[PDB]
Amino acid sequence: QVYNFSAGPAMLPVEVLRRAQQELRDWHGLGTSVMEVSHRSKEFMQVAEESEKDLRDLLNVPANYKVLFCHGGARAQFAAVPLNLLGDRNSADYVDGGYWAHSAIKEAQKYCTPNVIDVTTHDNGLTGIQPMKQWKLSDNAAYVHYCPNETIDGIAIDEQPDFGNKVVVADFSSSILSRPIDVSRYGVIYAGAQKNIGPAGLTLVIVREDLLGKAHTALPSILDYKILADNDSMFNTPPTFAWYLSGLVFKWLKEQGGLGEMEKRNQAKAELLYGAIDRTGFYRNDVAITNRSWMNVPFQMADASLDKLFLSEAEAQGLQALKGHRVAGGMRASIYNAMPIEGVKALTDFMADFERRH
Amino acid sequence: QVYNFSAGPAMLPVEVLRRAQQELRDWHGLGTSVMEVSHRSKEFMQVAEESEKDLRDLLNVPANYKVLFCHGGARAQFAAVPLNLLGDRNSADYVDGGYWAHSAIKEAQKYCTPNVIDVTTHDNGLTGIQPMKQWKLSDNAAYVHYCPNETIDGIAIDEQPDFGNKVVVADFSSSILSRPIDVSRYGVIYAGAQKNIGPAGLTLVIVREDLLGKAHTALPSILDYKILADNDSMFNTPPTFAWYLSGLVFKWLKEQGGLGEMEKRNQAKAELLYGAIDRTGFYRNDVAITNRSWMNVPFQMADASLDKLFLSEAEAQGLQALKGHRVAGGMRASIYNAMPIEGVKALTDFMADFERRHG
Ligand SMILES: *Cc1c(COP(=O)(O)O)cnc(C)c1O
Numbered sequence: 001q002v003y004n005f006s007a008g009p010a011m012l013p014v015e016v017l018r019r020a021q022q023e024l025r026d027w028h029g030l031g032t033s034v035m036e037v038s039h040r041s042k043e044f045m046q047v048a049e050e051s052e053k054d055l056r057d058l059l060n061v062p063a064n065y066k067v068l069f070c071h072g073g074a075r076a077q078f079a080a081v082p083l084n085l086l087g088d089r090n091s092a093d094y095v096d097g098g099y100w101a102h103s104a105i106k107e108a109q110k111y112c113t114p115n116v117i118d119v120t121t122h123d124n125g126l127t128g129i130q131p132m133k134q135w136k137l138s139d140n141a142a143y144v145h146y147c148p149n150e151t152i153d154g155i156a157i158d159e160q161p162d163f164g165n166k167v168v169v170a171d172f173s174s175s176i177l178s179r180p181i182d183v184s185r186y187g188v189i190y191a192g193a194q195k196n197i198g199p200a201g202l203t204l205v206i207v208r209e210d211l212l213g214k215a216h217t218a219l220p221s222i223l224d225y226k227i228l229a230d231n232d233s234m235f236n237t238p239p240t241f242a243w244y245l246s247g248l249v250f251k252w253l254k255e256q257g258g259l260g261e262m263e264k265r266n267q268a269k270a271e272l273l274y275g276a277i278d279r280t281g282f283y284r285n286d287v288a289i290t291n292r293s294w295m296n297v298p299f300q301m302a303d304a305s306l307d308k309l310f311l312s313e314a315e316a317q318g319l320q321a322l323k324g325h326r327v328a329g330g331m332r333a334s335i336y337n338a339m340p341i342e343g344v345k346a347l348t349d350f351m352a353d354f355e356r357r358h
Numbered sequence: 359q360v361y362n363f364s365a366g367p368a369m370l371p372v373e374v375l376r377r378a379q380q381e382l383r384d385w386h387g388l389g390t391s392v393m394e395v396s397h398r399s400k401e402f403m404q405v406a407e408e409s410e411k412d413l414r415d416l417l418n419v420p421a422n423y424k425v426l427f428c429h430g431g432a433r434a435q436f437a438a439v440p441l442n443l444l445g446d447r448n449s450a451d452y453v454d455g456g457y458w459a460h461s462a463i464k465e466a467q468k469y470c471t472p473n474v475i476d477v478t479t480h481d482n483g484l485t486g487i488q489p490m491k492q493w494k495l496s497d498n499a500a501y502v503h504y505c506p507n508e509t510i511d512g513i514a515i516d517e518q519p520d521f522g523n524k525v526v527v528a529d530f531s532s533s534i535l536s537r538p539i540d541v542s543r544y545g546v547i548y549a550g551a552q553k554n555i556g557p558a559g560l561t562l563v564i565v566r567e568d569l570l571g572k573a574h575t576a577l578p579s580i581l582d583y584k585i586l587a588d589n590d591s592m593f594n595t596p597p598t599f600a601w602y603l604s605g606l607v608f609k610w611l612k613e614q615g616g617l618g619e620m621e622k623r624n625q626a627k628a629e630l631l632y633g634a635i636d637r638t639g640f641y642r643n644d645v646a647i648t649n650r651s652w653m654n655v656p657f658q659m660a661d662a663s664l665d666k667l668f669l670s671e672a673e674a675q676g677l678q679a680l681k682g683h684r685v686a687g688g689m690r691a692s693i694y695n696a697m698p699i700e701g702v703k704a705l706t707d708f709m710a711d712f713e714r715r716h717g
Pocket residue numbers: 008072073074075076100147149150151171172173174192193195594595596
């Protein structure tokens with residue numbers, strides 16, 4: 001039995017993949033794949049509408065937000081955000097609490113002079129994040145940009161933002177759909193599809209409508225929020241298979257009880273794994289408890305000379321893609337929505353009996 | 359049997375789809391889909407390298423061109439072309455002979471003041487194109503941009519360019535890999551994958567290496583050819599499944615005998631279908647002989663009030679997605695690489711039966 005702990009692209013719900021396999025060649029009796037049909041067919045149109053509706057229901061998006069499906073991954077959004085949003089102004093506030101937040105800053109430097117606010121705390125060797133209340137924001141920022149779940153670091157910011165009428169932008173790539181969020185606190189939420197949804201080549205953007213209409217002329221059109229909104233995300237040919245699949249994944253999410261039920265399953269999973277790490281000195285995670293990601297769980301061995309053996313023996317027991325980042329070394333288990341608790345139990349059994357042996 | 363004449367997204371080769379179906383859930387024995395793994399895995403990196411290599415061999419790409427796999431579709435290249443290539447030049451030459459070449463112009467207006475050369479001819483009701491010899495090009499232009507196959511109009515420019523040290527950019531979306539081309543005559547070739555590869559969500563860009571490094575600062579990194587090239591199209595997460603499938607397409611092309619065999623097959627398929635249109639007054643095509651696309655074949659009926667019955671009866675026989683464009687009405691058959699001659703035959707047999715009835 002195989003479990004795939006890959007950080008992105010990532011496991012898809014087993015049931016979504018089964019259904020997709022089933023209809024790969026004959027979709028809805030048409031004798032063609034979903035992949036070979038026009039995005040303007042009645043049939044694809046339905047997928048496009050059902051999936052927007054299903055997403056609004058799951059996350060409870062208000063009517064004043066546009067729901068866009070975009071080419072280009074989240075790194076496109078690192079450019080598309082400043083281009084759409086800078087408006088008449090000359091910078092925005094960028095909250096820097098890890099790699100991906102840093103990445104966005106580095107692209108922002110093409111379009112502005114980003115005000116880099118470092119938010120990382122280091123109390124007792126543990127790494128955490130400053131409370132929002134003390135973040136040193138500008139009066140003049142076009143917006144405030146932050147990453148609520150840092151996929152490499154295993155650091156989440158769980159608190160909802162309650163800033164002014166400041167425009168908040170959040171890269172939710174690696175934790176979107178993991179629990180409910182209060183969409184109304186946000187200007188833009190974006191997420192590359194390939195992590196906590198699963199399929200690569202699609203990016204989700206959710207945009208408050210009043211923010212449209214101020215995009216810079218240099219912004220290529222396929223990344224213009226207004227243009228996408230005016231064309232129901234079909235200004236050009238969309239990544240249709242990816243969109244159909246994300247639609248399957250929204251269906252599956254509703255079958256499971258929605259994001260209230262995802263929150264419970266995901267807390268249960270994280271507590272299991274973090275528990276297995278914390279019971280013993282043999283493994284270590286050095287993120288502050290309050291800021292621990294449920295989605296991405298990095299960890300190291302007291303004795304790092306065992307990493308390779310740990311990874312090879314895990315893989316032989318079917319536990320795949322657990323290699324950590326170069327900097328930390330050690331391990332990272334990403335345990336997204338698709339990952340059932342039995343997946344995580346298999347990993348922690350394995351961790352236990354690896355410590356027994358060595 | 360179903361045959362699917364959709365213009366884009368389009369039919370994939372049947373054998374590619376039977377293979378993908380069989381490994382959808384357990385690829386390579388790993389117990390997982392190719393959709394579910396790192397783009398930085400040895401397994402996916404092997405896919406990436408092989409695909410690039412099979413492409414180079416199929417088209418005979420020379421050593422000094424980069425092969426890039428990109429997000430965004432060809433509409434993204436309408437911006438990515440000017441931003442990558444303008445340098446300190448104010449304008450670029452835009453050859454205009456139809457819809458898709460027109461669309462490139464409007465996007466380029468964001469970045470430059472394009473020089474719009476109207477290249478269409480009109481003789482007898484027959485639409486055609488000026489030979490490249492007489493194209494009124496410009497000396498100060500950053501490059502020349504044209505579309506050798508206009509998907510909606512059914513108009514192709516077969517002539518390979520022979521301009522001097524001018525940089526030629528071409529939108530080969532609807533005919534890349536239909537036949538051999540002399541890649542050395544171009545600066546940039548690009549193509550959305552959804553047609554004559556077939557899989558949507560990936561775009562091909564072939565760029566002469568010396569053209570890299572003049573990118574404007576405003577260009578989003580994911581669209582910067584030099585960045586793509588420096589990172590082998592894995593600057594960000596690629597459309598893994600799409601790229602894989604394209605790779606299957608490349609292998610399939612190789613098993614069929616390469617682009618020289620495609621040319622013969624595609625020739626014979628067009629000849630059959632244009633044969634069915636020409637031999638009777640019931641169907642019509644108003645594109646000059648010399649400019650007739652082999653890939654997209656619009657055509658109308660003498661009596662346009664049969665259109666619905668025709669489309670409807672064709673569908674009942676397994677012939678799908680043949681509706682034309684509304685300016686023209688009538689029909690359009692796209693008959694890309696994946697489509698076998700048998701497919702085109704069922705359409706011409708159908709066309710004959712229908713004319714027999716209602717003619
Ligand atoms: C992976 C990741 C990105 C980059 O995603 P791409 O789709 O490869 O551009 C950005 N932000 C976060 C939090 C991520 O995990």
